Amino acid sequence: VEYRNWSKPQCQITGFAPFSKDNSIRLSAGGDIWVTREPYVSCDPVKCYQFALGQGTTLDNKHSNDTVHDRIPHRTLLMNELGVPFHLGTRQVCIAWSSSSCHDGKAWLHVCITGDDKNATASFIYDGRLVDSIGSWSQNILRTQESECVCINGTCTVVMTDGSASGRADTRILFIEEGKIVHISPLAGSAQHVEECSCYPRYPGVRCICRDNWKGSNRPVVDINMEDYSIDSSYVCSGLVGDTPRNDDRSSNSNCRNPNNERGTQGVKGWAFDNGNDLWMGRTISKDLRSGYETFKVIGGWSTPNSKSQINRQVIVDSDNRSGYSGIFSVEGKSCINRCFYVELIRGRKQETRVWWTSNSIVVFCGTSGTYGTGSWPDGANINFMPI
Amino acid sequence: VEYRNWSKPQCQITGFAPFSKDNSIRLSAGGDIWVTREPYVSCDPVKCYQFALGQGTTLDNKHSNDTVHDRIPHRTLLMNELGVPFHLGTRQVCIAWSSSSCHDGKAWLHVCITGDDKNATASFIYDGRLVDSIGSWSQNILRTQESECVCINGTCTVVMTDGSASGRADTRILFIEEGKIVHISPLAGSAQHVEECSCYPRYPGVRCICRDNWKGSNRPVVDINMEDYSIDSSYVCSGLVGDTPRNDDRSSNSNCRNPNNERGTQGVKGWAFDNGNDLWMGRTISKDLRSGYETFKVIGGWSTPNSKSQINRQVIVDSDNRSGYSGIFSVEGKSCINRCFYVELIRGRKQETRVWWTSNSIVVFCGTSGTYGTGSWPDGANINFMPI
Amino acid sequence: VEYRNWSKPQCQITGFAPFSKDNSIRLSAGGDIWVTREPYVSCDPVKCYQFALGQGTTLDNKHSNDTVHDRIPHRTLLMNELGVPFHLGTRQVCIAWSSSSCHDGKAWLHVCITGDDKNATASFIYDGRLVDSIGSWSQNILRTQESECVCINGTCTVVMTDGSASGRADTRILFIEEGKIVHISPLAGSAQHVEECSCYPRYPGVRCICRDNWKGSNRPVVDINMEDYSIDSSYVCSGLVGDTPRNDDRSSNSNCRNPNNERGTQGVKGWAFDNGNDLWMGRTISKDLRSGYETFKVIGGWSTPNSKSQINRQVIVDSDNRSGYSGIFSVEGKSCINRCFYVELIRGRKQETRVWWTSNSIVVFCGTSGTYGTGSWPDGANINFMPI
Amino acid sequence: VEYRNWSKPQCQITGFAPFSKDNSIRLSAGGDIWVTREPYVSCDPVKCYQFALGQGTTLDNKHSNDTVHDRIPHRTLLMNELGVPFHLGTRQVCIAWSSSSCHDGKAWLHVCITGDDKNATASFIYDGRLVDSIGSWSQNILRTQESECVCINGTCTVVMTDGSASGRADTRILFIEEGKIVHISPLAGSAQHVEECSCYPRYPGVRCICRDNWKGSNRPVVDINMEDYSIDSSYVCSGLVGDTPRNDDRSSNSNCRNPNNERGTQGVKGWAFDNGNDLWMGRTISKDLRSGYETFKVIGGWSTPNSKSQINRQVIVDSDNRSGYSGIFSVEGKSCINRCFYVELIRGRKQETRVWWTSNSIVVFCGTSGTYGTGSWPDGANINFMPI
Ligand SMILES: *[C@@H]1O[C@H](CO[C@H]2O[C@@H](C)[C@@H](O)[C@@H](O)[C@@H]2O)[C@@H](O[C@@H]2O[C@H](CO)[C@@H](O[C@@H]3O[C@H](CO)[C@@H](O)[C@H](O[C@H]4O[C@H](CO)[C@@H](O[C@@H]5O[C@H](CO)[C@@H](O[C@H]6O[C@H](CO)[C@H](OS(=O)(=O)O)[C@H](O)[C@H]6NC(C)=O)[C@H](O)[C@H]5NC(C)=O)[C@H](O)[C@@H]4O)[C@@H]3O)[C@H](O)[C@H]2NC(C)=O)[C@H](O)[C@H]1NC(C)=O
Ligand SMILES: *[C@@H]1O[C@H](CO)[C@@H](O[C@@H]2O[C@H](CO)[C@@H](O[C@@H]3O[C@H](CO[C@H]4O[C@H](CO)[C@@H](O)[C@H](O)[C@@H]4O)[C@@H](O)[C@H](O[C@H]4O[C@H](CO)[C@@H](O)[C@H](O)[C@@H]4O[C@H]4O[C@H](CO)[C@@H](O)[C@H](O)[C@@H]4O)[C@@H]3O)[C@H](O)[C@H]2NC(C)=O)[C@H](O)[C@H]1NC(C)=O
Ligand SMILES: *[C@@H]1O[C@H](CO)[C@@H](O[C@@H]2O[C@H](CO)[C@@H](O[C@@H]3O[C@H](CO[C@H]4O[C@H](CO)[C@@H](O)[C@H](O)[C@@H]4O)[C@@H](O)[C@H](O[C@H]4O[C@H](CO)[C@@H](O)[C@H](O)[C@@H]4O[C@H]4O[C@H](CO)[C@@H](O)[C@H](O)[C@@H]4O)[C@@H]3O)[C@H](O)[C@H]2NC(C)=O)[C@H](O)[C@H]1NC(C)=O
Ligand SMILES: *[C@@H]1O[C@H](CO)[C@@H](O[C@@H]2O[C@H](CO)[C@@H](O[C@@H]3O[C@H](CO[C@H]4O[C@H](CO)[C@@H](O)[C@H](O)[C@@H]4O)[C@@H](O)[C@H](O[C@H]4O[C@H](CO)[C@@H](O)[C@H](O)[C@@H]4O[C@H]4O[C@H](CO)[C@@H](O)[C@H](O)[C@@H]4O)[C@@H]3O)[C@H](O)[C@H]2NC(C)=O)[C@H](O)[C@H]1NC(C)=O
Numbered sequence A, B, C, D: 001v002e003y004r005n006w007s008k009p010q011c012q013i014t015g016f017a018p019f020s021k022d023n024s025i026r027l028s029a030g031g032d033i034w035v036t037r038e039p040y041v042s043c044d045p046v047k048c049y050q051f052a053l054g055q056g057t058t059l060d061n062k063h064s065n066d067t068v069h070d071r072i073p074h075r076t077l078l079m080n081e082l083g084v085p086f087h088l089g090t091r092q093v094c095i096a097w098s099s100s101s102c103h104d105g106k107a108w109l110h111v112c113i114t115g116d117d118k119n120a121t122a123s124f125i126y127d128g129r130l131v132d133s134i135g136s137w138s139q140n141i142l143r144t145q146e147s148e149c150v151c152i153n154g155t156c157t158v159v160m161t162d163g164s165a166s167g168r169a170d171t172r173i174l175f176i177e178e179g180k181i182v183h184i185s186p187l188a189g190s191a192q193h194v195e196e197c198s199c200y201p202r203y204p205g206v207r208c209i210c211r212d213n214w215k216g217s218n219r220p221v222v223d224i225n226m227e228d229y230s231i232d233s234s235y236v237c238s239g240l241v242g243d244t245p246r247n248d249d250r251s252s253n254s255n256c257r258n259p260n261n262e263r264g265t266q267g268v269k270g271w272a273f274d275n276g277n278d279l280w281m282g283r284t285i286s287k288d289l290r291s292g293y294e295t296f297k298v299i300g301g302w303s304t305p306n307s308k309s310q311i312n313r314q315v316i317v318d319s320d321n322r323s324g325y326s327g328i329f330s331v332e333g334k335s336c337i338n339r340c341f342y343v344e345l346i347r348g349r350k351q352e353t354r355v356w357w358t359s360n361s362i363v364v365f366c367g368t369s370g371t372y373g374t375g376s377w378p379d380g381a382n383i384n385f386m387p388i
């Protein structure tokens, strides 16, 4: 067994093709299914696994009432082969209300965060053993990715932040070998706020598109040099802009360097990735609510301040259905490495009031160089049939 | 690990012996079992797996209401070891309302089709990764086998069609190596309509008996030359005729070359395979409804226009119980390769009105050169005990 | 991987020690558990599996009503690691209302019997593939062991009978290599009726203690010569006598050669095994009903006509609780091969009338050369808490 | 595969970091979860498994009524990967109302005890086979660890006791190779009563901190010489004292040699381990009830009679929530071997009267040399939502 070094060209893609859907909410109205949120999928070298933070309860269970809250001591990271839903025989890999897992070629790495908001501890579990831990540096909710970390040659890097949600915060990128933190680098460059990074191997680096929860509608870019541990950061040039709230494409802007200050506050985890000077990306279809999801290529989106020429758009969840968080994940192919993404469909409170729980389900698509058609693949549950 | 090349004689068979039954509908009245239809079983070199398209819900779940529909975005391909039923811990291998999976010696191939009827996309998942995709060529429901594809020396072939259901349609046979489409051949020869092929290794070719949904009660034969990618097609000579609707054996005909035009429209997936000049086959016992299932050898059935001398018949599901789709699957034996088949028993709407769901269960038999007796092995559920 | 040849001394045993209990009936009042009967456990070279014939339904399911019947088309052989109960994710290995499985060192062999009582077919599934089949020779319920077959050097032998239940019947011992029947030997020697053999490796032979359902309270002994395929048969000498109905030890007899004709008709599957001139055995504690279960050594029980000196008795299920079938299974130890047994605890109709189902649970003990104490380990379900 | 010899330094630890929580009671109000108590986790060389004694029933099942009792014939040892809860597909490894499992590098060892209180039998199951058994020496509840045994170079040692609960009792330490008892040593040194040892590898020995159920609030220390089979025993020096009932730190004492006689009677399984002259330990936060759980280092706690200087304390379950038994488990790390612990959170009767069952759930932490924060991770179930 050898370490993953990811040195293969990114595959050229034409757009995305359907890959998986687990249908957890339709099934919960006739089965015992875990209540979850912040899902993600990561992939070892032979097969793919889906993950999620559970709320320590199943949906048709009175303990699902008020699961809107993001942090309780009972949240654990659930892990299953991609496609098998979170039934009662699923494994709780660790205690966590914030996580990031990745496989380095030889074993899985899970960083799990639980604890008091003001004094959280992050555990680094590697190959089944606890190998290290870190406590909260700014005493205000130590958080992380909520999607995959990425390892090159034995070192896995994860980006975490502690500080204000909508204010200045402290961000450090950690480099860890076999579960042991081997270096910590503070954020550098121009990003003003960084939360939930969606990171991906871009040999010899790793690149992350994150959430700016303070001043931007455009998303931050964090660049990690795996050899010097140097960090660099900017914003995505695309004038099209992927966070929610966002302005609307007529009036939206990005200059590649600062927060655009257009409906800056709040956000949603998202992804985007480069292809030459172009950008492939997804965002919700609504500019105000987390509804619908669409992906497209922005010609010039990676390199020209404000480029808004779009092409190859695809609807993934129509605008009348709910979406949520989304992230990227890379699968190594035979000749190139491909990029795929998952989009969390959340259901329940606060937006839907008939029930007292909050849960999600997932749908995931992978890049393709072939051809494809059209569709909309939403959650599917009829809220009127659900246990409340 | 090496590629399956299937070069071994077909085993001589005497008839079929019982092999598996999963009992999914009896169990659904006291367990959480997936709602499914279009089942099939395929087999890797060490063990056999059963598959089916689920309706993204379990039976005792309000979302099972109106599952009569064949295509919704929530259908996924379910996969389990043959014999373990589709309980909540089953894996949804991909998104699909039409599929075909096969194992080439080294990994599984799944072609999954989802999307808009007018603009569907077929994904080629090989060894866990998405490796290729194709969009709809005639903009009218891209569909495929619904049973096993077959691979020889590394190339797997699947036959798909897009076009009218009962009208002229476009059929292409795709050759794919490691998930990547390496050639596409249009249908050739005399078949007029080809849907749902039941294909099997017949070294160095592959032969398929399909469904003619427009003008025939006799079934099409598609012959694929794995070396030139040439396609040839005809109809099965047997005057006995396996599609449903069918005429009745007194008045039924087939001339090996054209649709017989006897109750042509509509059909049901079926199988049949050759043995010298003889034909082994199964069809429903009713000539109008999908009820009962029987298998037999037709002396001369493969080679003489209209041969109707039957022998070795076996009832598999008596004529008072429901059957459905059926297909073939080959298992490599020690000295010869054997042929087996599965018969889908559907239950629910539209035929049975007490409940609002539609689901199936399966029973599967394998060829045998030994001896056997008689029986009838139907679904078994008492419709009056079912959740509605 | 090599073939099991069982050539190691039988371990000297002092009595039996507790080994497993699966608690299927207590659990069925709060879980979806398969309805089953005729359980048995067999063991491959690394681990042990428990088996049973299911009634194609779970207990809290309306289809469990009237499961008293021994043969319906929906019965399948269930198989799980010893100790995990038959939950909905269990595998139905084959269709069968009568079975026998064994592992020959390299793969499992399952002989499964389904079909019409007057024309049943037995399938020989080996290593996942159907490899052979046989039809009913006397047209009257082809039946077999209901416990483990045993293989030595590649050949597995099973004993089957077809004929009257309580009358003269036809018994053949089949020798099968890799799933293929390689020889069939008719019964020889003095046994008058042979049903349900409990067989065990006794290098270079196999010895079986069976059920005489016509004229005996003493149990038949069938001896198979694996090298000439010769069969020999007698009755167990012990005057103590293990079938139920039985007379009572004061008035019971056995002369090692003929049925004792003491409450001959009917019976129950049982086991017994030799140790020098002694006999280790188990029987129900009642001489009329299948209640309680006790094991003991009968000094001289193997060799002296009528020996009744008992020693080392152990109660396994007290006389106020229900028991059922019981059988033997051998596990190869490090220096000797040990003998273990399972005892089926049945519940439900006809004896208990509150519920309409019939099911069992199991408890299993293994030989030991150490020390042990006392106990009673019954089913445990309170019939008043059960779903009816 | 080679035998575990545990010869690596203990890792230096700073305190404990969160490791797993299975949430079995919240889940039981919406799923079929086993009723259990006396949990523990043990770990083979690649991964960790959690264990527990089940009460042969699930919680939402009428058979859970009155599960307060510690010994019934239906209790079995359950075993799963750490983190997957005891759902219906869990394996009952053996019959037992008292257990101890450990992995010696090459296979698991399970000592299981069932039987009559006055005449219990302990089975030694090794690598799937029963290999030995022992009967009760003092005819009064043969009991054992209820947490992991530990093996060095092929020999596993377990400590068992038979005798009075609160009175003089007989304790023997057994040494077993491959499931076979190879030597038995009676307790020696100064401990007066020894129950439930929490033992750990301390090359070349094994050290155990146990429960003194007769005369002490301070816990016994048992030292096993793996080379001479010599036993030595004392009490933990720490004046802080970990059993419950206990006096309170102002008035508590320990002189390293005798029971302190401060609220001696009764107890609770616990752990503690040495680090130079210091002691790491956990105890309940209440000195009277099993509520809350806290861990800390006692400077001088291992070597100075009565040392009470505490430092590094951590709350694990706040004082307003229930805790229970706790034990230690060692995981071999890359350069040193680490120590981890589990704390059983019990719920139900007798303390909580709304329901009629008694069950537990677990939370587990592992040592860490890094940093950490604060939290409280209790069971979580709202007793008013539970099935009764
Ligand atoms: C968890 O477990 C516990 C304990 O578990 C064990 O419990 C049982 C269930 C076992 O089976 C095990 O499986 C289990 O593990 C449970 O707790 C128990 O729950 C019981 C109820 O479920 C409760 O009540 C008991 O239950 C027993 C069986 O369930 C009964 O036998 C018992 O009563 C018996 O004796 C009674 C004597 O009076 C008798 O009463 C009859 O009724 C009338 C009442 O009006 C008597 O007299 C009146 O009669 C007429 C009118 O009809 C005249 O009226 S009038 O005055 O003129 O107007 C009479 O004059 C008047 N009498 C006067 C004035 O004196 C009548 O005479 C009686 N009949 C006779 C023939 O005597 C009754 O029929 C029974 O025979 C009682 O019901 C248990 O106490 C309770 N135990 C504990 C420790 O809690 C838990 O419930 C479960 N539950 C859960 C959820 O876990
Ligand atoms: C079957 O399935 C296939 C695959 O899904 C599908 O094809 C894809 O269709 C989409 C939708 O049309 C294509 O994406 C669009 O691409 C155009 C750009 O392409 C045109 O122009 C360039 C040069 O500019 C030419 O080279 C090219 O040949 C085309 O002529 C974009 O402009 C589209 O974006 C606009 O439209 C979206 C809605 O479709 C808006 O939401 C978006 O905001 C953009 O609108 C803005 O700009 C417009 C002017 O530029 C303006 O008019 C609006 O008001 C607004 O300001 C979109 O990206 C995609 O590329 C196709 N993919 C491929 C591989 O062919 C089939 O359509 C489908 N058919 C059916 C029946 O289902
Ligand atoms: C125990 O189990 C065994 C195995 O299942 C079973 O044996 C099988 O029985 C079936 C049913 O009889 C056999 O199949 C029939 O085969 C005949 C042909 O065989 C006869 O004729 C040939 C020469 O022609 C001889 O060589 C041979 O020895 C036989 O004499 C077919 O004719 C049968 O088909 C007709 O009957 C069917 C119903 O059985 C109809 O549904 C079908 O439509 C056919 O009918 C048409 O033709 C008839 C004249 O040809 C006419 O009379 C009708 O009106 C109609 O027009 C059928 O294929 C099978 O081969 C046996 N298998 C083996 C290996 O022996 C036992 O019967 C079973 N016994 C019991 C008690 O359960
Ligand atoms: C703790 O746990 C241990 C292990 O379970 C247990 O020890 C076992 O006890 C049983 C029950 O006593 C023992 O089995 C009995 O063995 C005697 C024979 O042994 C005696 O005699 C021989 C010579 O004959 C001596 O060598 C030997 O030392 C003994 O003195 C059998 O006779 C017993 O069978 C009779 O009793 C049964 C009930 O116990 C009846 O059901 C059975 O039908 C037999 O009765 C018939 O014969 C009797 C005269 O022979 C007559 O009196 C009756 O009316 C009837 O006609 C039985 O097999 C077993 O060997 C012990 N095992 C070991 C390894 O020691 C402890 O007893 C247990 N203690 C407690 C308190 O739980």
Ligand SMILES: *[C@@H]1O[C@H](CO)[C@@H](O[C@@H]2O[C@H](CO)[C@@H](O[C@@H]3O[C@H](CO[C@H]4O[C@H](CO)[C@@H](O)[C@H](O)[C@@H]4O)[C@@H](O)[C@H](O[C@H]4O[C@H](CO)[C@@H](O)[C@H](O)[C@@H]4O[C@H]4O[C@H](CO)[C@@H](O)[C@H](O)[C@@H]4O)[C@@H]3O)[C@H](O)[C@H]2NC(C)=O)[C@H](O)[C@H]1NC(C)=O
Pocket: A118, A119, A135, D014, D015, D296, D310, D311, D312, D313, D314, D372, D373, D374
């Ligand atoms: C964020 O998370 C971190 C990690 O959890 C946490 O840090 C830890 O805090 C705890 C609680 O304070 C620390 O443990 C205490 O340690 C002191 C000893 O340390 C002091 O004194 C020594 C020399 O004596 C100095 O070297 C050292 O620098 C400190 O000044 C203990 O005394 C504490 O025990 C007493 O307090 C407990 C409650 O905290 C009592 O329950 C216990 O019974 C002890 O009380 C008794 O003695 C007292 C006098 O000694 C007396 O006043 C009482 O009345 C009573 O008689 C305790 O062990 C731990 O070491 C810290 N860990 C690390 C790695 O730093 C942060 O506090 C946390 N912050 C927030 C906001 O959440």
Ligand SMILES: CC(=O)N[C@H]1[C@H]([C@H](O)[C@H](O)CO)O[C@@](O)(C(=O)O)C[C@@H]1O
Pocket: A038, A070, A071, A097, A098, A141, A142, A143, A164, A165, A166, A195, A196, A213, A267, A268, A269
């Ligand atoms: C650790 C934690 O609470 N993370 C939460 C984050 C933070 O609130 C934002 O990043 C602001 O910092 O976002 C969510 O609330 C959200 O957008 O739905 C969900 C997530 O659980």
Ligand SMILES: CC(=O)N[C@H]1[C@H]([C@H](O)[C@H](O)CO)O[C@@](O)(C(=O)O)C[C@@H]1O
Pocket: B038, B070, B071, B097, B098, B141, B142, B143, B164, B165, B166, B195, B196, B213, B267, B268, B269
């Ligand atoms: C992709 C799709 O809809 N396939 C469906 C096909 C087509 O309708 C026919 O092939 C006509 O083209 O047949 C069914 O309707 C049927 O016979 O029960 C089921 C199946 O789901």
Ligand SMILES: CC(=O)N[C@H]1[C@H]([C@H](O)[C@H](O)CO)O[C@@](O)(C(=O)O)C[C@@H]1O
Pocket: C038, C070, C071, C097, C098, C141, C142, C143, C164, C165, C166, C195, C196, C213, C267, C268, C269
């Ligand atoms: C194949 C079959 O029906 N086997 C059944 C046998 C036969 O009836 C007897 O062997 C008489 O032949 O015994 C049972 O009825 C019984 O004793 O409970 C159960 C079993 O299912």
Ligand SMILES: CC(=O)N[C@H]1[C@H]([C@H](O)[C@H](O)CO)O[C@@](O)(C(=O)O)C[C@@H]1O
Pocket: D038, D070, D071, D097, D098, D141, D142, D143, D164, D165, D166, D195, D196, D213, D267, D268, D269
């Ligand atoms: C074998 C057995 O009954 N063990 C039990 C022990 C003993 O009672 C004590 O060790 C006194 O000997 O402790 C418990 O009761 C307890 O503390 O909750 C639980 C456990 O099941």
Ligand SMILES: *[C@@H]1O[C@H](CO)[C@@H](O)[C@H](O)[C@H]1NC(C)=O
Pocket: B002, B005, B006, B007
């Ligand atoms: C088919 O494969 C087998 C097994 O690898 C090989 O021995 C045989 O020669 C091959 N035959 C052909 C015609 O490819």
Ligand SMILES: *[C@@H]1O[C@H](CO)[C@@H](O)[C@H](O)[C@H]1NC(C)=O
Pocket: D002, D005, D006, D007
């Ligand atoms: C312990 O085991 C390791 C791994 O096999 C070995 O290298 C080491 O030398 C052993 N040490 C002792 C003291 O047995």
Ligand SMILES: [Ca+2]
Pocket: A211, A212, A213, A214, A215, A216, A217, A243, A244, A245, A263, A264, A265, A266, A267, A268
């Ligand atoms: Ca924002």
Ligand SMILES: [Ca+2]
Pocket: B211, B212, B213, B214, B215, B216, B217, B243, B244, B245, B263, B264, B265, B266, B267, B268
């Ligand atoms: Ca037709």
Ligand SMILES: [Ca+2]
Pocket: C211, C212, C213, C214, C215, C216, C217, C243, C244, C245, C263, C264, C265, C266, C267, C268
């Ligand atoms: Ca009899």
Ligand SMILES: [Ca+2]
Pocket: D211, D212, D213, D214, D215, D216, D217, D243, D244, D245, D263, D264, D265, D266, D267, D268
């Ligand atoms: Ca005490």
